[PDB]
Amino acid sequence: YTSAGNVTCWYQTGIVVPAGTPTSCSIMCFVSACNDFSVRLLKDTPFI
Protein backbone atom coordinates (compact mmCIF):
# COMPACT_ATOMS: atom_id res chain seq x y z
CA TYR A 1 0.00 0.00 0.00
CA THR A 2 3.18 2.02 -0.28
CA SER A 3 5.54 0.56 -2.93
CA ALA A 4 8.10 3.03 -1.60
CA GLY A 5 11.36 2.81 0.30
CA ASN A 6 11.65 3.36 4.02
CA VAL A 7 14.16 4.37 6.68
CA THR A 8 14.35 3.00 10.24
CA CYS A 9 16.58 3.60 13.24
CA TRP A 10 17.63 1.01 15.80
CA TYR A 11 19.39 1.07 19.16
CA GLN A 12 22.78 -0.49 18.67
CA THR A 13 24.10 0.26 22.16
CA GLY A 14 22.10 2.67 24.27
CA ILE A 15 23.10 6.00 25.76
CA VAL A 16 25.77 6.25 28.46
CA VAL A 17 26.08 9.38 30.61
CA PRO A 18 28.09 10.56 33.60
CA ALA A 19 26.61 11.90 36.83
CA GLY A 20 24.69 15.18 36.88
CA THR A 21 23.27 15.19 33.35
CA PRO A 22 19.73 15.40 31.96
CA THR A 23 17.94 12.13 31.35
CA SER A 24 16.27 12.24 27.94
CA CYS A 25 17.72 13.30 24.59
CA SER A 26 16.31 14.17 21.18
CA ILE A 27 16.91 13.70 17.46
CA MET A 28 15.81 16.17 14.78
CA CYS A 29 15.45 15.59 11.03
CA PHE A 30 15.89 17.84 7.97
CA VAL A 31 14.75 17.14 4.40
CA SER A 32 15.82 18.78 1.15
CA ALA A 33 16.15 18.00 -2.54
CA CYS A 34 19.30 17.21 -4.47
CA ASN A 35 20.33 18.99 -7.66
CA ASP A 36 18.44 16.86 -10.18
CA PHE A 37 14.72 17.24 -9.63
CA SER A 38 12.03 17.38 -12.32
CA VAL A 39 8.38 18.44 -12.17
CA ARG A 40 5.71 18.45 -14.89
CA LEU A 41 2.03 19.33 -15.46
CA LEU A 42 1.24 22.38 -13.34
CA LYS A 43 -2.11 21.92 -11.63
CA ASP A 44 -4.14 23.24 -8.70
CA THR A 45 -2.93 22.81 -5.14
CA PRO A 46 -5.15 20.67 -2.85
CA PHE A 47 -4.52 22.67 0.31
CA ILE A 48 -6.91 25.62 0.20
Partner: protein, 222 residues
Protein backbone atom coordinates in the same frame (compact mmCIF):
# COMPACT_ATOMS: atom_id res chain seq x y z
CA UNK B 1 11.89 24.61 -17.11
CA UNK B 2 8.26 24.29 -16.15
CA UNK B 3 9.25 25.46 -12.67
CA UNK B 4 10.50 28.77 -14.05
CA UNK B 5 8.86 31.86 -12.58
CA UNK B 6 7.27 32.88 -15.88
CA UNK B 7 5.60 29.51 -16.47
CA UNK B 8 4.43 29.43 -12.86
CA UNK B 9 2.61 32.78 -12.92
CA UNK B 10 1.83 33.95 -16.48
CA UNK B 11 -1.69 32.42 -16.55
CA UNK B 12 -5.19 33.85 -16.87
CA UNK B 13 -8.09 33.76 -14.42
CA UNK B 14 -11.51 35.32 -13.84
CA UNK B 15 -11.28 37.86 -11.01
CA UNK B 16 -14.63 39.68 -11.03
CA UNK B 17 -18.18 39.05 -12.24
CA UNK B 18 -20.58 41.98 -12.03
CA UNK B 19 -24.01 42.87 -13.35
CA UNK B 20 -25.38 46.19 -14.59
CA UNK B 21 -28.63 47.45 -16.10
CA UNK B 22 -29.74 49.93 -18.73
CA UNK B 23 -32.58 51.38 -16.67
CA UNK B 24 -33.32 51.03 -12.96
CA UNK B 25 -34.39 52.98 -9.86
CA UNK B 26 -31.18 52.52 -7.88
CA UNK B 27 -28.58 54.36 -10.05
CA UNK B 28 -25.78 52.21 -8.63
CA UNK B 29 -27.10 49.16 -10.49
CA UNK B 30 -26.51 51.04 -13.73
CA UNK B 31 -22.75 50.52 -13.89
CA UNK B 32 -20.17 47.94 -12.87
CA UNK B 33 -17.20 48.61 -10.64
CA UNK B 34 -14.05 46.89 -9.42
CA UNK B 35 -11.06 48.12 -7.43
CA UNK B 36 -7.95 46.32 -8.65
CA UNK B 37 -6.00 44.87 -5.74
CA UNK B 38 -4.03 41.63 -5.79
CA UNK B 39 -5.45 40.38 -2.51
CA UNK B 40 -9.04 39.65 -3.50
CA UNK B 41 -8.64 36.80 -6.00
CA UNK B 42 -7.86 33.63 -4.07
CA UNK B 43 -6.56 31.98 -7.26
CA UNK B 44 -3.43 34.09 -7.63
CA UNK B 45 -3.17 35.17 -3.97
CA UNK B 46 -1.57 32.08 -2.45
CA UNK B 47 0.84 31.76 -5.39
CA UNK B 48 1.99 35.34 -4.81
CA UNK B 49 2.53 34.90 -1.07
CA UNK B 50 5.69 32.90 -1.76
CA UNK B 51 7.44 36.16 -2.62
CA UNK B 52 7.96 39.51 -0.97
CA UNK B 53 8.28 41.97 -3.87
CA UNK B 54 6.87 41.55 -7.40
CA UNK B 55 7.00 43.50 -10.66
CA UNK B 56 4.82 42.78 -13.70
CA UNK B 57 2.73 44.15 -16.55
CA UNK B 58 -0.98 43.37 -16.65
CA UNK B 59 -3.22 42.13 -19.45
CA UNK B 60 -7.00 42.23 -19.16
CA UNK B 61 -9.62 40.63 -21.41
CA UNK B 62 -13.39 41.16 -21.02
CA UNK B 63 -16.30 38.81 -21.76
CA UNK B 64 -19.71 40.48 -21.87
CA UNK B 65 -23.22 39.00 -22.25
CA UNK B 66 -26.69 40.56 -22.19
CA UNK B 67 -30.33 39.57 -21.82
CA UNK B 68 -33.73 41.21 -22.04
CA UNK B 69 -35.86 41.33 -18.90
CA UNK B 70 -38.88 39.06 -18.57
CA UNK B 71 -41.01 41.97 -17.42
CA UNK B 72 -43.59 42.84 -20.05
CA UNK B 73 -42.50 43.91 -23.53
CA UNK B 74 -41.78 41.63 -26.49
CA UNK B 75 -41.58 42.03 -30.25
CA UNK B 76 -38.50 44.27 -30.15
CA UNK B 77 -36.00 44.64 -32.99
CA UNK B 78 -33.01 46.08 -31.17
CA UNK B 79 -29.65 46.94 -32.79
CA UNK B 80 -26.46 45.54 -31.21
CA UNK B 81 -25.51 47.10 -27.90
CA UNK B 82 -22.47 49.27 -27.26
CA UNK B 83 -20.42 49.16 -24.08
CA UNK B 84 -17.89 51.57 -22.55
CA UNK B 85 -15.01 50.25 -20.43
CA UNK B 86 -13.00 52.93 -18.62
CA UNK B 87 -9.74 52.47 -16.72
CA UNK B 88 -8.73 55.05 -14.11
CA UNK B 89 -5.03 55.43 -13.23
CA UNK B 90 -4.08 55.93 -9.57
CA UNK B 91 -4.99 59.55 -9.03
CA UNK B 92 -7.89 60.09 -11.44
CA UNK B 93 -11.48 61.13 -10.86
CA UNK B 94 -14.23 58.69 -9.94
CA UNK B 95 -17.80 58.73 -11.31
CA UNK B 96 -20.90 58.75 -9.17
CA UNK B 97 -23.57 58.09 -11.78
CA UNK B 98 -23.65 57.01 -15.39
CA UNK B 99 -24.48 60.57 -16.49
CA UNK B 100 -21.37 62.05 -14.87
CA UNK B 101 -18.89 64.30 -16.65
CA UNK B 102 -16.05 62.03 -15.51
CA UNK B 103 -16.92 59.47 -18.17
CA UNK B 104 -15.64 61.97 -20.76
CA UNK B 105 -12.28 63.05 -19.34
CA UNK B 106 -9.33 62.92 -21.68
CA UNK B 107 -6.93 61.17 -19.30
CA UNK B 108 -8.90 58.05 -18.44
CA UNK B 109 -8.25 55.43 -21.14
CA UNK B 110 -11.51 54.00 -22.42
CA UNK B 111 -12.65 51.28 -24.85
CA UNK B 112 -15.84 51.25 -26.91
CA UNK B 113 -17.16 47.97 -28.20
CA UNK B 114 -20.23 46.45 -29.80
CA UNK B 115 -21.52 42.92 -29.44
CA UNK B 116 -20.79 40.17 -31.93
CA UNK B 117 -17.13 41.11 -32.32
CA UNK B 118 -13.99 39.68 -30.73
CA UNK B 119 -13.67 40.28 -26.97
CA UNK B 120 -11.90 43.48 -25.92
CA UNK B 121 -8.42 43.69 -24.52
CA UNK B 122 -5.98 46.24 -23.12
CA UNK B 123 -2.56 46.14 -21.49
CA UNK B 124 -1.15 48.04 -18.48
CA UNK B 125 2.48 48.89 -17.66
CA UNK B 126 4.06 48.72 -14.21
CA UNK B 127 2.41 51.77 -12.60
CA UNK B 128 4.28 52.56 -9.42
CA UNK B 129 6.44 55.42 -8.25
CA UNK B 130 8.26 52.77 -6.24
CA UNK B 131 10.43 50.10 -7.79
CA UNK B 132 8.31 47.00 -7.04
CA UNK B 133 4.97 46.10 -5.63
CA UNK B 134 4.80 44.91 -2.03
CA UNK B 135 3.03 41.71 -1.06
CA UNK B 136 3.91 42.36 2.58
CA UNK B 137 4.28 45.57 4.57
CA UNK B 138 5.20 45.67 8.28
CA UNK B 139 4.18 49.18 9.24
CA UNK B 140 1.63 51.94 8.90
CA UNK B 141 0.23 54.03 6.08
CA UNK B 142 1.04 57.36 7.77
CA UNK B 143 -3.06 55.04 10.15
CA UNK B 144 -3.80 51.56 8.82
CA UNK B 145 -1.45 48.67 9.53
CA UNK B 146 -0.22 46.56 6.65
CA UNK B 147 -1.43 48.96 3.96
CA UNK B 148 0.78 51.39 2.08
CA UNK B 149 0.07 53.82 -0.74
CA UNK B 150 2.49 52.34 -3.29
CA UNK B 151 0.18 49.44 -4.22
CA UNK B 152 -2.49 51.65 -5.79
CA UNK B 153 -3.16 50.24 -9.23
CA UNK B 154 -6.50 51.70 -10.33
CA UNK B 155 -10.13 50.88 -10.99
CA UNK B 156 -12.48 49.68 -13.77
CA UNK B 157 -15.92 51.06 -14.67
CA UNK B 158 -18.35 49.68 -17.28
CA UNK B 159 -21.68 51.05 -18.54
CA UNK B 160 -23.98 51.02 -21.58
CA UNK B 161 -23.54 53.63 -24.31
CA UNK B 162 -27.24 54.06 -25.11
CA UNK B 163 -28.95 57.30 -26.02
CA UNK B 164 -31.82 58.75 -24.00
CA UNK B 165 -34.68 56.77 -22.37
CA UNK B 166 -33.41 53.30 -23.31
CA UNK B 167 -34.94 49.83 -23.36
CA UNK B 168 -34.59 47.57 -20.30
CA UNK B 169 -31.73 45.09 -20.55
CA UNK B 170 -29.25 43.68 -18.06
CA UNK B 171 -25.63 42.88 -18.81
CA UNK B 172 -22.91 40.83 -17.14
CA UNK B 173 -19.13 41.26 -17.34
CA UNK B 174 -16.32 38.80 -16.64
CA UNK B 175 -12.87 40.29 -16.20
CA UNK B 176 -9.94 38.03 -17.06
CA UNK B 177 -6.56 38.95 -15.67
CA UNK B 178 -3.05 37.88 -16.65
CA UNK B 179 0.46 38.98 -15.60
CA UNK B 180 3.41 39.32 -17.93
CA UNK B 181 7.18 39.85 -17.61
CA UNK B 182 7.20 38.84 -13.97
CA UNK B 183 10.15 39.23 -11.58
CA UNK B 184 10.17 38.26 -7.89
CA UNK B 185 12.36 38.73 -4.82
CA UNK B 186 12.89 37.29 -1.31
CA UNK B 187 11.05 33.94 -1.01
CA UNK B 188 8.78 33.24 1.96
CA UNK B 189 7.27 30.11 3.50
CA UNK B 190 3.76 29.13 2.38
CA UNK B 191 0.57 29.97 4.17
CA UNK B 192 -0.45 27.18 6.54
CA UNK B 193 -3.73 28.87 7.47
CA UNK B 194 -7.03 29.59 5.78
CA UNK B 195 -7.40 33.22 4.76
CA UNK B 196 -9.94 35.15 6.81
CA UNK B 197 -10.22 38.62 5.26
CA UNK B 198 -8.80 40.25 2.14
CA UNK B 199 -6.77 43.02 3.80
CA UNK B 200 -4.80 41.51 6.69
CA UNK B 201 -2.91 38.31 7.48
CA UNK B 202 -5.25 37.28 10.31
CA UNK B 203 -5.88 33.60 11.00
CA UNK B 204 -6.76 30.93 13.53
CA UNK B 205 -4.17 28.48 14.93
CA UNK B 206 -4.05 25.23 12.98
CA UNK B 207 -2.12 21.99 13.40
CA UNK B 208 1.26 21.56 11.73
CA UNK B 209 0.39 18.32 9.89
CA UNK B 210 -1.81 15.22 10.21
CA UNK B 211 -1.44 12.33 12.62
CA UNK B 212 -0.58 8.66 12.33
CA UNK B 213 -0.66 5.60 14.57
CA UNK B 214 2.82 5.62 16.08
CA UNK B 215 6.32 6.86 15.36
CA UNK B 216 7.21 3.43 13.96
CA UNK B 217 4.19 2.99 11.70
CA UNK B 218 4.82 2.17 8.03
CA UNK B 219 1.90 0.88 5.91
CA UNK B 220 2.10 -2.62 4.48
CA UNK B 221 3.95 -3.17 1.20
CA UNK B 222 1.76 -4.40 -1.64
Amino acid sequence: SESSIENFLCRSACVYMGEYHTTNTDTSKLFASWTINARRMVQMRRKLELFTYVRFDMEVTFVITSKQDQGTQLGQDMPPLTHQIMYIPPGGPIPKSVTDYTWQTSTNPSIFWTEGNAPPRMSIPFISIGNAYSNFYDGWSHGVYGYNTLNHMGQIYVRHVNGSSPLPMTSTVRMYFKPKHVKVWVPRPPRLCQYKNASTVNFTPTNITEKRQSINYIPETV
